[PDB]
Amino acid sequence: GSLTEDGLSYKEKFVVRSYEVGSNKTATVETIANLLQEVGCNHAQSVGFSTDGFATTTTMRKLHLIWVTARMHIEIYKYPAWGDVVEIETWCQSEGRIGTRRDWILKDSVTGEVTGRATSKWVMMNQDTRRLQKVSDDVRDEYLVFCPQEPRLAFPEENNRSLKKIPKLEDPAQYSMIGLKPRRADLDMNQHVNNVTYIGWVLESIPQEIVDTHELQVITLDYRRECQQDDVVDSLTTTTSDSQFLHLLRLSGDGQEINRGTTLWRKK
């Protein structure tokens, strides 16, 4: 991998592995999401920020501050097959005092064609109190020289799917997968549940018939709270319709919301 010529974005190539593919012999959306995380981490390392997924500055580390994912939006046109080489380009942009955005473009290495695109919204939070805060001028100027100045968006279309508000699923859910627990493989180096595990948990309540007859085209997921290493999660899904679904992940006990999302599936 490497920063591009102008140093304002980062590119990396990946060869899809045998254990990374699903029933269609192509990469799963969770394999894709882990690759987005990997290219983001290598971009942060290349310019001197932390490499723990939080991309912090020395100023942020002294005032125990981290960047945390608020929303993840992924649209895939073609999932790469086993042995295929996929090239991913990523960049960040500041969004005023609200937070920051990281975008990605996935291309097939042989054809040069765009096979997918993703966007994520990040907010600043104190790692101990979990309290969010607006981005200061000093902890914004530090990132400015590593981002494009003019807007560069993976999803430019006005009124696009990545910015739509997601409602709360009402009980009873049409489908559910209850009692989901993380194991050590679901944790990151800081012992927190990896952001991609939540995507898997969301997808657990989609019936196998849909997975067998359709391909996932779009997934938008809002992150509200963490599942701790010892928490248990219930995954709920209701059809809102192409097939579209509304999703909710909540803690098994008290029903506390951890995530909400939407998925769009096209017939194979």
Ligand X SMILES: CC1=NN(c2ccccc2)C(=O)C1
What is the binding site for a second copy (CB under 8 A)? 17-19, 21-23, 25, 28, 30, 34, 37-38, 41-42, 45, 51, 53, 82-83, 179-181, 183-185, 187-191, 194, 196, 200-201, 203-204, 211
Q: Which residues, 6 or more positions from 210, have their beta carbon under 8 angstroms from its beta carbon? A: 243, 265
Q: Is 149 helix (H, G, I), strand (E, B) or coil?
A: coil
From a second copy, ligand X, none, interface partner of 134 (C-beta below 5 to 8 A by class)? none
Active site residue 190: yes
Q: Which residues, 6 or more positions from 156, have their beta carbon under 8 angstroms from its beta carbon? A: none
User: Alpha-carbon distance 58 to 31, whole Å?
Assistant: 31
212: its two tokens: 């067998």
Our separate counts of H helices and E strands in the chain read 5, 12
Nearest CA to 201 out of 188, 183, 174 is that of: 183
Minimum CB–partner distance for residue 170 and a second copy (Å)? 25
Q: Please, which residue, 135 or 248, has the CB nearer to a second copy?
A: 248
Active site residue 227: yes
Q: State which of positions 195-234 bind ligand X (CB under 6 A).
A: 195, 223-226
Q: Please, which residue, 53 or 261, has the CB nearer to a second copy?
A: 53
C-alpha dihedral (165, 168, 170, 175), degrees to nearest 10: 90
From a second copy, ligand X, none, interface partner of 187 (C-beta below 5 to 8 A by class)? a second copy
Q: Is the peptide bond before 207 cis (omega within 30 degrees of 0)?
A: no
Minimum CB–partner distance for residue 142 and a second copy (Å)? 22
- The answer to the question of residue 79 lying near ligand X (CB under 6 A) is no
Q: Please, which residue, 45 or 176, has the CB nearer to a second copy?
A: 45
Minimum CB–partner distance for residue 52 and a second copy (Å)? 8
Catalytically annotated residue among 41, 195, 227, 247: 227
The pattern of x and - marking residues 46 through 65 that bind ligand X according to CB under 6 A reads -x-x-----x----------
Alpha helices in 87-187 (DSSP H): 138-144
Sign, CA dihedral 118-29-238-121, equals negative
Q: Please, which residue, 26 or 93, has the CB nearer to a second copy?
A: 26
Report yes or no: 8 and 146 within 8 Å, Cβ to Cβ. Answer: yes
Annotated active-site positions, please? 190, 192, 227
What residue ranges bind ligand X (CB under 6 A)? 43-44, 47, 49, 55, 67-70, 92, 94, 100, 123, 143, 146-147, 195, 223-226
